[PDB]
Amino acid sequence: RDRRERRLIFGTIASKMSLAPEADLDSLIIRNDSLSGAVIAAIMQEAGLRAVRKNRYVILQSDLEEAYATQVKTDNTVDKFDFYK
Amino acid sequence: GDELTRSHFNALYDTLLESNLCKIIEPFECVEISHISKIIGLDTQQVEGKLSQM
Amino acid sequence: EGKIDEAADILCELQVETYGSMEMSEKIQFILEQMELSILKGDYSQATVLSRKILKKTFKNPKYESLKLEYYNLLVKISLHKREYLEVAQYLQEIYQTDAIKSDEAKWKPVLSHIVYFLVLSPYGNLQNDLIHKIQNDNNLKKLESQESLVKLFTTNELMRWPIVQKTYEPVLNEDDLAFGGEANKHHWEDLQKRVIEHNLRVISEYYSRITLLRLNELLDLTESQTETYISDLVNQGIIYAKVNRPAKIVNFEKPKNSSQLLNEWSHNVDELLEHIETIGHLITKEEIMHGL
């Protein structure tokens, strides 16, 4: 994948959701690397789960950061202690 | 200076006009042309030329 | 100390993360007061979001005295920035039955006038016909019959006496210090005049099939530039549809031609002769009994 190439996925799902003018959509395409469309779909949905958790119908910038902290686990491994060697 | 920008300039010129053309077409037709150019904001010859092209 | 924005920002940055949903007595009361700080601050979005939390939870909870009265005031105060008289009319359906059961007619009579104020100034809706009869009406009251006649006035209103009616009786109309706010009466005249024109063209189409545009302008109390504004708004918003001819100065109802002529409208010609065979059946029995004996 690529930083600006993944915008067609992150940005398309963002068009179907309510976002705030201060929400940063560039932070999702920087740290994330090589994600499938299904995993990306869970990122935007998790941001909405953080908005309803705060009793807000508009996704803020903090909800996009809290959604990434849950999605840091992509491959199936034990914490950061994997790759024994 | 850009040919691609001017090519899309007439695309929006007909797009923003179509949005203005749909404003006079929404009510009932058979009105005066002199009042049509006042609503759109262009000359009578310019409105009749672009509308007939569509 | 004279602080407005600072006083509201303190409670909004605390009460949200304070309560752990333990005691709802002090929580619900202070959230209703938290919306009051957003009113002085001027943020309609803060009060709108806070109104989606405890409002539905209060419905499941039993009715109280001081708690339920705060919802009726805040839902009216949020209409300053919203300026929508249709939504508030639905918010007053609970207080309409509250003052008629829990309270007495002392506080029920003025609120009855306010409910009509939001109905008269409502742009449109499907509940306007259901709000004509209501429940507790026909109580033999001067204020009840006066406000009820204004609902059906839109049919026969010529807009000739419209400025006269508001001046003679002005309970909710011109000078209203209850359930309203503002720096002048301009909000009363501008909002009411735009509605009575929209509600007038609705019944005119349902009655006059073809009317001259010159005579139509006298009924709307407008000019050539003002009349075309309300007509283009009702058609673009999908309210009503009619024919407007500027050069011909002829306004028509625009009867649909999709009825397929004799495939549908012919059903009216058979009902012309249909009732004969039924009435003859009743006459054959009755005629022979009275004439024979």
Coordinates of N, CA and C in Angstrom, one line a residue, chain C residues 105-293:
Chain C
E105 N -56.6 24.2 35.4 CA -56.8 25.1 34.2 C -56.2 26.4 34.3
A106 N -55.6 26.8 35.5 CA -55.0 28.1 35.7 C -53.7 28.2 34.8
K107 N -52.9 27.2 34.8 CA -51.7 27.1 34.0 C -52.0 26.4 32.6
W108 N -53.1 25.8 32.5 CA -53.4 25.1 31.2 C -53.9 26.1 30.2
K109 N -54.6 27.1 30.5 CA -55.1 28.1 29.6 C -54.0 28.8 28.8
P110 N -53.0 29.4 29.5 CA -51.9 30.1 28.7 C -51.1 29.2 27.9
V111 N -50.8 28.0 28.4 CA -50.0 27.0 27.6 C -50.8 26.6 26.3
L112 N -52.1 26.5 26.4 CA -53.0 26.2 25.2 C -52.7 27.3 24.1
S113 N -52.6 28.5 24.5 CA -52.3 29.6 23.5 C -50.9 29.4 22.9
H114 N -49.9 29.0 23.7 CA -48.6 28.8 23.2 C -48.5 27.6 22.2
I115 N -49.2 26.5 22.5 CA -49.2 25.4 21.6 C -49.8 25.8 20.2
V116 N -50.8 26.6 20.2 CA -51.4 27.1 18.9 C -50.4 28.0 18.2
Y117 N -49.6 28.8 19.0 CA -48.6 29.7 18.4 C -47.6 28.9 17.5
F118 N -47.1 27.8 18.1 CA -46.1 27.0 17.3 C -46.8 26.2 16.2
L119 N -48.1 26.0 16.3 CA -48.8 25.3 15.2 C -49.1 26.3 14.0
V120 N -49.5 27.5 14.3 CA -49.8 28.5 13.3 C -48.6 28.8 12.5
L121 N -47.4 28.9 13.2 CA -46.2 29.3 12.6 C -45.4 28.0 12.1
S122 N -46.0 26.9 12.2 CA -45.3 25.7 11.6 C -45.5 25.7 10.1
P123 N -44.4 25.4 9.3 CA -44.5 25.4 7.9 C -45.5 24.4 7.3
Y124 N -45.5 23.2 7.7 CA -46.4 22.2 7.3 C -46.3 20.9 8.2
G125 N -47.0 19.9 7.9 CA -46.9 18.7 8.6 C -48.2 17.8 8.4
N126 N -48.0 16.5 8.8 CA -49.1 15.6 8.7 C -49.9 15.6 10.0
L127 N -49.5 16.2 11.1 CA -50.2 16.2 12.3 C -51.0 17.5 12.5
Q128 N -51.0 18.4 11.5 CA -51.8 19.6 11.7 C -53.3 19.3 11.7
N129 N -53.7 18.3 11.0 CA -55.2 18.0 11.0 C -55.5 17.3 12.3
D130 N -54.6 16.5 12.9 CA -54.9 15.9 14.2 C -54.9 16.9 15.3
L131 N -54.2 18.0 15.2 CA -54.1 19.0 16.2 C -55.3 20.0 16.2
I132 N -56.3 19.8 15.2 CA -57.4 20.6 15.2 C -58.4 20.3 16.3
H133 N -58.7 19.0 16.5 CA -59.6 18.5 17.5 C -58.9 18.4 18.9
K134 N -57.7 18.0 18.9 CA -56.9 17.7 20.1 C -57.7 16.8 21.0
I135 N -57.7 17.0 22.3 CA -58.3 16.2 23.3 C -59.3 17.0 24.1
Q136 N -58.8 17.9 24.9 CA -59.5 18.7 25.9 C -60.3 19.9 25.4
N137 N -60.3 20.0 24.0 CA -61.0 21.2 23.4 C -62.5 21.0 23.6
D138 N -63.2 22.0 23.1 CA -64.7 22.1 23.3 C -65.0 22.2 24.8
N139 N -64.1 23.0 25.5 CA -64.3 23.2 27.0 C -65.1 24.4 27.3
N140 N -65.6 25.1 26.2 CA -66.4 26.4 26.4 C -65.5 27.4 27.1
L141 N -64.5 27.8 26.3 CA -63.6 28.9 26.8 C -63.3 29.9 25.6
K142 N -63.2 31.1 26.0 CA -63.0 32.2 25.0 C -61.6 32.0 24.4
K143 N -60.6 31.7 25.1 CA -59.3 31.6 24.6 C -59.2 30.3 23.8
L144 N -59.9 29.3 24.1 CA -59.9 28.0 23.4 C -60.5 28.1 22.0
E145 N -61.7 28.8 22.0 CA -62.4 29.0 20.7 C -61.7 30.0 19.8
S146 N -61.0 31.0 20.4 CA -60.4 32.0 19.6 C -59.2 31.4 18.9
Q147 N -58.4 30.6 19.6 CA -57.2 30.0 19.0 C -57.5 28.9 18.0
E148 N -58.6 28.2 18.3 CA -59.1 27.2 17.4 C -59.6 27.7 16.0
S149 N -60.2 28.9 16.1 CA -60.7 29.5 14.8 C -59.5 30.0 13.9
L150 N -58.4 30.3 14.5 CA -57.2 30.7 13.8 C -56.6 29.5 13.0
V151 N -56.8 28.3 13.5 CA -56.3 27.1 12.8 C -57.1 26.9 11.5
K152 N -58.4 27.0 11.5 CA -59.3 26.9 10.3 C -59.4 28.2 9.6
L153 N -58.7 29.3 10.1 CA -58.8 30.5 9.4 C -58.0 30.5 8.0
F154 N -57.0 29.6 7.9 CA -56.2 29.6 6.7 C -57.0 29.3 5.5
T155 N -58.1 28.7 5.6 CA -58.9 28.3 4.4 C -59.6 29.6 3.9
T156 N -60.3 30.4 4.7 CA -61.0 31.5 4.2 C -60.2 32.8 4.4
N157 N -59.0 32.8 4.8 CA -58.2 34.0 5.0 C -57.8 34.7 3.7
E158 N -58.2 35.9 3.5 CA -57.9 36.7 2.4 C -56.7 37.6 2.6
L159 N -56.1 37.6 3.8 CA -54.9 38.4 4.2 C -55.3 39.9 4.1
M160 N -56.6 40.2 4.2 CA -57.0 41.6 4.3 C -57.0 42.1 5.7
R161 N -57.5 41.3 6.6 CA -57.6 41.6 8.1 C -56.4 41.0 8.9
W162 N -55.5 40.4 8.2 CA -54.3 39.8 8.9 C -53.6 40.7 9.8
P163 N -53.2 42.0 9.4 CA -52.6 42.9 10.4 C -53.6 43.4 11.4
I164 N -54.9 43.3 11.2 CA -55.9 43.8 12.1 C -56.1 42.8 13.3
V165 N -56.1 41.5 12.9 CA -56.3 40.5 13.9 C -55.2 40.4 14.9
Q166 N -54.0 40.6 14.5 CA -52.9 40.5 15.5 C -52.8 41.7 16.4
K167 N -53.3 42.8 15.9 CA -53.3 44.0 16.8 C -54.4 44.0 17.8
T168 N -55.6 43.5 17.4 CA -56.8 43.5 18.4 C -56.5 42.5 19.5
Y169 N -56.2 41.3 19.2 CA -55.9 40.3 20.2 C -54.4 39.8 19.9
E170 N -53.6 40.0 20.9 CA -52.2 39.6 20.8 C -51.7 38.8 22.0
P171 N -52.3 37.7 22.3 CA -51.9 36.9 23.4 C -50.5 36.2 23.2
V172 N -50.4 35.5 22.1 CA -49.1 34.9 21.6 C -48.5 35.7 20.4
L173 N -49.2 36.7 19.9 CA -48.9 37.1 18.5 C -47.9 38.2 18.5
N174 N -48.2 39.4 19.0 CA -47.3 40.6 18.9 C -46.4 40.7 20.1
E175 N -47.0 40.9 21.3 CA -46.3 41.0 22.5 C -46.4 39.7 23.3
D176 N -45.4 38.9 23.4 CA -45.4 37.7 24.1 C -44.1 37.6 24.9
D177 N -44.2 37.6 26.2 CA -43.1 37.5 27.1 C -42.8 36.1 27.6
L178 N -43.7 35.1 27.3 CA -43.6 33.8 27.7 C -43.3 32.9 26.5
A179 N -42.4 31.9 26.8 CA -41.9 30.9 25.7 C -41.4 31.6 24.5
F180 N -40.8 32.8 24.7 CA -40.2 33.5 23.5 C -39.1 34.4 24.1
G181 N -38.2 34.8 23.2 CA -37.2 35.8 23.5 C -36.7 36.5 22.2
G182 N -36.2 37.7 22.5 CA -35.7 38.5 21.4 C -35.6 40.0 21.8
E183 N -35.0 40.7 20.9 CA -34.8 42.2 21.1 C -36.0 43.0 20.5
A184 N -36.9 42.5 19.8 CA -38.0 43.2 19.2 C -39.1 42.3 18.7
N185 N -40.1 42.8 18.1 CA -41.2 42.1 17.6 C -41.1 41.6 16.2
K186 N -39.9 41.9 15.5 CA -39.8 41.6 14.1 C -39.9 40.1 13.9
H187 N -39.5 39.3 14.9 CA -39.6 37.8 14.8 C -41.1 37.4 14.7
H188 N -42.0 38.2 15.3 CA -43.4 37.8 15.3 C -44.0 38.1 13.9
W189 N -43.7 39.3 13.3 CA -44.3 39.6 12.0 C -43.7 38.9 10.9
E190 N -42.4 38.7 10.9 CA -41.7 38.0 9.7 C -42.1 36.6 9.7
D191 N -42.1 35.9 10.8 CA -42.4 34.5 10.8 C -43.8 34.2 10.5
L192 N -44.7 35.0 11.1 CA -46.2 34.7 10.9 C -46.6 35.0 9.5
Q193 N -46.1 36.1 8.9 CA -46.5 36.5 7.6 C -46.0 35.5 6.5
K194 N -44.9 34.9 6.7 CA -44.4 33.9 5.7 C -45.2 32.6 5.8
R195 N -45.8 32.3 7.0 CA -46.5 31.0 7.1 C -47.9 31.2 6.5
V196 N -48.6 32.3 6.9 CA -50.0 32.5 6.4 C -50.1 32.6 4.9
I197 N -49.0 33.0 4.2 CA -49.0 33.0 2.8 C -48.8 31.5 2.3
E198 N -48.0 30.7 2.9 CA -47.8 29.4 2.4 C -49.1 28.5 2.7
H199 N -49.7 28.7 3.9 CA -50.9 28.0 4.2 C -52.1 28.5 3.3
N200 N -52.0 29.7 2.8 CA -53.1 30.2 2.0 C -53.1 29.6 0.6
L201 N -52.0 29.5 -0.1 CA -51.9 28.9 -1.4 C -52.2 27.4 -1.4
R202 N -52.2 26.8 -0.3 CA -52.6 25.4 -0.3 C -54.1 25.2 -0.5
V203 N -54.9 26.0 0.2 CA -56.4 25.8 0.0 C -56.8 26.5 -1.3
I204 N -56.1 27.5 -1.8 CA -56.6 28.2 -3.0 C -56.5 27.2 -4.2
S205 N -55.4 26.4 -4.2 CA -55.3 25.4 -5.3 C -56.4 24.4 -5.2
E206 N -56.7 23.9 -4.0 CA -57.8 22.9 -3.8 C -59.2 23.4 -4.1
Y207 N -59.3 24.7 -4.3 CA -60.6 25.3 -4.6 C -60.7 25.9 -6.0
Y208 N -59.9 26.9 -6.3 CA -59.8 27.5 -7.6 C -59.0 26.7 -8.6
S209 N -59.7 26.2 -9.6 CA -58.9 25.4 -10.7 C -58.1 26.4 -11.6
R210 N -58.8 27.4 -12.1 CA -58.1 28.4 -13.0 C -58.5 29.8 -12.5
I211 N -57.5 30.6 -12.2 CA -57.6 31.9 -11.7 C -56.7 32.9 -12.4
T212 N -57.1 34.1 -12.6 CA -56.2 35.1 -13.2 C -55.1 35.5 -12.2
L213 N -53.9 35.6 -12.8 CA -52.8 36.0 -12.0 C -52.9 37.4 -11.4
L214 N -53.6 38.3 -12.1 CA -53.8 39.7 -11.6 C -54.7 39.7 -10.4
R215 N -55.8 38.9 -10.4 CA -56.6 38.8 -9.2 C -55.9 38.0 -8.1
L216 N -55.0 37.1 -8.5 CA -54.3 36.3 -7.4 C -53.4 37.2 -6.6
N217 N -52.8 38.2 -7.2 CA -51.8 39.0 -6.5 C -52.5 39.8 -5.4
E218 N -53.8 40.2 -5.6 CA -54.5 40.9 -4.6 C -54.9 40.1 -3.4
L219 N -55.0 38.8 -3.5 CA -55.3 37.9 -2.4 C -54.1 37.6 -1.5
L220 N -52.9 37.7 -2.1 CA -51.7 37.4 -1.3 C -51.1 38.6 -0.6
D221 N -51.6 39.8 -0.9 CA -51.1 41.0 -0.3 C -49.6 41.2 -0.6
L222 N -49.2 41.0 -1.9 CA -47.9 41.0 -2.3 C -47.7 41.8 -3.6
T223 N -46.5 41.8 -4.2 CA -46.3 42.4 -5.4 C -45.9 41.3 -6.5
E224 N -45.5 41.8 -7.7 CA -45.1 40.9 -8.7 C -43.8 40.1 -8.3
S225 N -42.9 40.8 -7.6 CA -41.6 40.2 -7.2 C -41.8 39.4 -5.9
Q226 N -42.8 39.7 -5.1 CA -43.0 39.0 -3.9 C -43.8 37.7 -4.1
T227 N -44.8 37.8 -5.1 CA -45.6 36.6 -5.3 C -44.8 35.5 -5.9
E228 N -43.9 35.8 -6.9 CA -43.1 34.7 -7.5 C -42.1 34.0 -6.5
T229 N -41.9 34.7 -5.3 CA -41.0 34.1 -4.4 C -41.6 32.9 -3.7
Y230 N -42.8 33.1 -3.2 CA -43.5 32.0 -2.4 C -44.0 30.9 -3.4
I231 N -44.3 31.2 -4.6 CA -44.7 30.2 -5.6 C -43.5 29.2 -5.9
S232 N -42.3 29.8 -6.1 CA -41.2 29.0 -6.5 C -40.7 28.2 -5.3
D233 N -41.0 28.6 -4.1 CA -40.6 27.9 -2.9 C -41.4 26.7 -2.6
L234 N -42.7 26.8 -2.8 CA -43.6 25.7 -2.6 C -43.5 24.6 -3.6
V235 N -43.1 25.0 -4.9 CA -42.9 24.0 -5.9 C -41.6 23.3 -5.8
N236 N -40.5 24.0 -5.4 CA -39.2 23.4 -5.3 C -39.1 22.5 -4.1
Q237 N -39.8 22.8 -3.0 CA -39.8 22.0 -1.8 C -40.8 20.8 -1.9
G238 N -41.6 20.7 -3.0 CA -42.5 19.6 -3.1 C -43.8 19.8 -2.3
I239 N -44.3 21.0 -2.1 CA -45.5 21.3 -1.4 C -46.7 21.2 -2.3
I240 N -46.8 22.1 -3.2 CA -47.9 22.1 -4.2 C -47.4 22.4 -5.6
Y241 N -48.2 22.1 -6.6 CA -47.8 22.3 -8.0 C -49.0 22.9 -8.7
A242 N -48.7 23.9 -9.5 CA -49.7 24.6 -10.3 C -49.1 25.2 -11.5
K243 N -49.9 25.9 -12.3 CA -49.4 26.6 -13.6 C -49.3 28.1 -13.4
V244 N -48.2 28.7 -13.7 CA -48.0 30.1 -13.7 C -47.5 30.6 -15.0
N245 N -48.4 31.4 -15.6 CA -48.0 32.0 -17.0 C -47.8 33.5 -16.8
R246 N -46.6 33.9 -16.9 CA -46.3 35.4 -16.8 C -46.9 36.2 -18.0
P247 N -46.6 35.9 -19.2 CA -47.2 36.7 -20.3 C -48.8 36.6 -20.4
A248 N -49.3 35.4 -20.1 CA -50.8 35.2 -20.2 C -51.5 35.7 -18.9
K249 N -50.7 35.8 -17.8 CA -51.3 36.2 -16.5 C -52.5 35.3 -16.1
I250 N -52.3 34.0 -16.3 CA -53.3 33.0 -16.0 C -52.7 31.9 -15.1
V251 N -53.3 31.6 -14.0 CA -52.8 30.6 -13.0 C -53.8 29.4 -13.1
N252 N -53.3 28.2 -13.2 CA -54.1 27.0 -13.4 C -53.7 26.0 -12.3
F253 N -54.6 25.0 -12.1 CA -54.3 24.0 -11.1 C -53.4 22.9 -11.5
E254 N -53.1 22.8 -12.9 CA -52.3 21.8 -13.4 C -52.9 20.4 -13.1
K255 N -54.0 20.1 -13.7 CA -54.7 18.8 -13.5 C -53.9 17.7 -14.3
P256 N -53.6 16.6 -13.6 CA -52.8 15.6 -14.2 C -53.6 14.9 -15.4
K257 N -52.9 14.7 -16.5 CA -53.4 14.0 -17.7 C -53.1 12.5 -17.7
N258 N -52.5 12.0 -16.7 CA -52.1 10.6 -16.6 C -53.2 9.7 -16.2
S259 N -54.4 10.2 -16.0 CA -55.5 9.4 -15.6 C -56.0 8.4 -16.7
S260 N -55.4 8.5 -17.9 CA -55.6 7.5 -19.0 C -57.1 7.6 -19.5
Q261 N -57.7 8.8 -19.3 CA -59.0 9.1 -19.8 C -60.1 8.0 -19.4
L262 N -60.6 7.4 -20.4 CA -61.7 6.4 -20.2 C -61.3 5.2 -19.4
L263 N -60.0 5.0 -19.2 CA -59.5 3.8 -18.4 C -59.7 4.1 -16.9
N264 N -59.9 5.3 -16.5 CA -60.2 5.6 -15.1 C -61.4 6.5 -14.9
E265 N -61.3 7.7 -15.5 CA -62.4 8.7 -15.3 C -63.8 8.2 -15.7
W266 N -63.8 7.2 -16.5 CA -65.1 6.6 -16.9 C -65.9 6.0 -15.8
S267 N -65.2 5.6 -14.7 CA -65.8 5.1 -13.5 C -66.8 6.1 -12.9
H268 N -66.7 7.4 -13.2 CA -67.6 8.3 -12.7 C -68.9 8.3 -13.5
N269 N -68.9 7.9 -14.7 CA -70.1 7.9 -15.5 C -71.0 6.7 -15.2
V270 N -70.4 5.6 -14.7 CA -71.3 4.5 -14.3 C -71.9 4.7 -13.0
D271 N -71.2 5.4 -12.1 CA -71.9 5.7 -10.8 C -73.0 6.8 -11.0
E272 N -73.0 7.5 -12.1 CA -74.1 8.3 -12.4 C -75.5 7.6 -12.5
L273 N -75.5 6.5 -13.2 CA -76.6 5.6 -13.4 C -76.7 4.4 -12.4
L274 N -75.7 4.3 -11.5 CA -75.6 3.1 -10.7 C -76.6 3.1 -9.6
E275 N -76.9 4.2 -9.0 CA -77.8 4.2 -7.8 C -79.3 4.1 -8.3
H276 N -79.6 4.1 -9.6 CA -81.0 3.9 -10.0 C -81.5 2.6 -9.6
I277 N -80.8 1.5 -10.0 CA -81.2 0.2 -9.8 C -81.4 -0.1 -8.3
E278 N -80.7 0.6 -7.4 CA -80.8 0.4 -6.0 C -82.1 1.1 -5.5
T279 N -82.3 2.4 -5.9 CA -83.4 3.1 -5.5 C -84.7 2.5 -6.0
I280 N -84.7 2.0 -7.2 CA -85.9 1.3 -7.7 C -86.2 0.1 -6.9
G281 N -85.2 -0.7 -6.4 CA -85.5 -1.8 -5.6 C -86.2 -1.5 -4.3
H282 N -85.9 -0.3 -3.7 CA -86.6 0.1 -2.5 C -87.9 0.7 -2.8
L283 N -88.2 1.2 -4.0 CA -89.4 1.8 -4.4 C -90.5 0.7 -4.7
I284 N -90.1 -0.4 -5.4 CA -91.0 -1.4 -5.8 C -91.7 -2.0 -4.6
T285 N -91.0 -2.2 -3.5 CA -91.6 -2.7 -2.3 C -92.5 -1.7 -1.6
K286 N -92.1 -0.4 -1.6 CA -92.8 0.6 -0.9 C -94.0 1.1 -1.7
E287 N -93.9 1.2 -3.0 CA -95.0 1.7 -3.8 C -96.2 0.8 -3.8
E288 N -96.0 -0.5 -3.9 CA -97.1 -1.4 -4.0 C -97.9 -1.5 -2.7
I289 N -97.2 -1.3 -1.6 CA -97.9 -1.4 -0.3 C -98.8 -0.2 0.0
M290 N -98.3 1.0 -0.3 CA -99.1 2.2 0.0 C -100.2 2.4 -1.0
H291 N -99.9 2.2 -2.3 CA -100.8 2.4 -3.3 C -101.9 1.3 -3.4
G292 N -101.5 0.1 -3.1 CA -102.4 -1.0 -3.2 C -103.4 -1.1 -2.1
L293 N -103.0 -0.7 -0.9 CA -103.9 -0.7 0.3 C -104.4 0.7 0.5

